[PDB]
């Protein structure tokens with residue numbers, strides 16, 4: 001915790017920049033990457049499962065926004081995530097929202113927030129990279145392109161990164177781009193989603209926001225099954241400021257808070273979505289996952305996969321592994337043989 005004590009004082013973005021640099025250098029030396037693997041490598045083989053036609057050695061993965069440009073792909077294997085998702089990328093390179101774009105909320109252990117180098121820089125990294133783990137791609141609309149031209153942006157990006165990806169995630173959820181959450185409306189989403197599905201064979205997913213009405217989510221789920229999409233990703237950062245326990249929230253201004261406050265919504269969303277389109281499509285639960293018992297409530301609610309961002313900043317290097325072994329324990333304690341078996345156990349027994 002002393003490193004965190006040293007690290008929390010410097011601005012969160014600048015601290016991330018340094019942490020980012022350090023992990024990029026660890027991927028440079030192959031043996032130390034192997035050695036960090038050789039320090040916490042045994043992943044219980046039961047945890048491995050195959051979802052939407054791609055298999056995953058473990059269910060826990062890194063949520064988009066950490067490596068947006070795909071510079072430290074190799075580093076993440078040693079950290080012990082099952083799968084990786086490169087941060088949200090827009091076809092044409094976009095400067096992110098100007099500073100200060102990131103704030104800390106210590107007491108709730110939450111943070112508030114599409115800077116990217118484009119599909120070009122990513123494809124170059126994907127043209128000379130040996131994937132230790134399955135890597136995913138999160139696609140987004142460039143801020144400059146209007147709503148009419150947006151469908152072409154989402155399409156144009158999909159072809160560039162599509163073949164070199166394990167799965168595609170469509171980001172219509174993150175609040176930090178104006179008039180993007182509105183695209184989540186079904187009639188606008190169908191042109192976007194249908195176009196991407198045709199352009200690449202790799203499975204495609206859509207990322208929903210947690211601040212949407214219950215009726216809306218049931219309509220978006222009906223779109224996905226028709227479009228035969230792989231999965232639904234729930235949830236992105238929420239705009240609501242309710243429940244926070246770190247002072248001076250009001251001033252900080254626009255953004256999406258992420259972490260433990262979001263958890264209660266992400267579970268509810270996961271509960272609803274799994275009952276409706278559980279069998280037809282996969283579900284990945286993201287947002288506010290920090291402990292093994294928290295992750296266990298997600299897996300038993302039908303989350304085939306789990307990604308999280310906030311946990312890593314506060315948890316540390318062990319955090320990835322302790323979740324896995326914690327889940328692995330529950331699987332042995334439940335008499336389960338693999339991961340798919342335990343998925344949706346809390347729901348089926350109902």
Ligand SMILES: Cc1cc2nc3c(=O)[nH]c(=O)nc-3n(C[C@H](O)[C@H](O)[C@H](O)COP(=O)(O)O)c2cc1C
Nearest residue numbers: 063064065113235236237259287288289308309310
């Ligand atoms: C500070 C921050 C910024 C993020 N930015 C993005 C983003 O721009 N695009 C995206 O697709 N996901 C982004 N994410 C990931 C999502 O927030 C994540 O899927 C989820 O909503 C929150 O995960 P967590 O609560 O486990 O940290 C970001 C996460 C954090 C913490």
